[PDB]
Symmetry: C4
Subunit: 34 residues, 4 copies
């Protein structure tokens, strides 16, 4: 239970979540003008 390890884990989870949300928005936007 290193603080850096736990923070890095949570940040990786949040990073992938926000990435799929951002790219979902952008892929839905680009899925209309093509």
């Amino acid at each position: 239970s290193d603080p850096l390890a736990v923070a890095a884990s949570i940040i990786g989870i949040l990073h992938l979540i926000l990435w799929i949300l951002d790219r979902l928005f952008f892929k839905s936007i680009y899925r209309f003008f093509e």
Copy 2:
């Protein structure tokens, strides 16, 4: 730790999906150049 394993697998899938996304968008925005 289960948290470390979850974060590791999420990081690997994140890199893989980001690479596929980058290939998609680089081959989609490589026609303009």
Copy 3:
């Protein structure tokens, strides 16, 4: 844990922060000109 894990944790936190600033900049540019 080991230097590899510590550096990887610092780097993952940096990566989240950097991608946050990148997407915030792009969303602020696409939230005023669209």
Copy 4:
């Protein structure tokens, strides 16, 4: 100080930072000649 999964994820995180840095660098560059 050795989990194979942890070492793999660490190397992957470093390479991910490097690749995203290069991606956004050349992206910002392309978006620097167009603005």
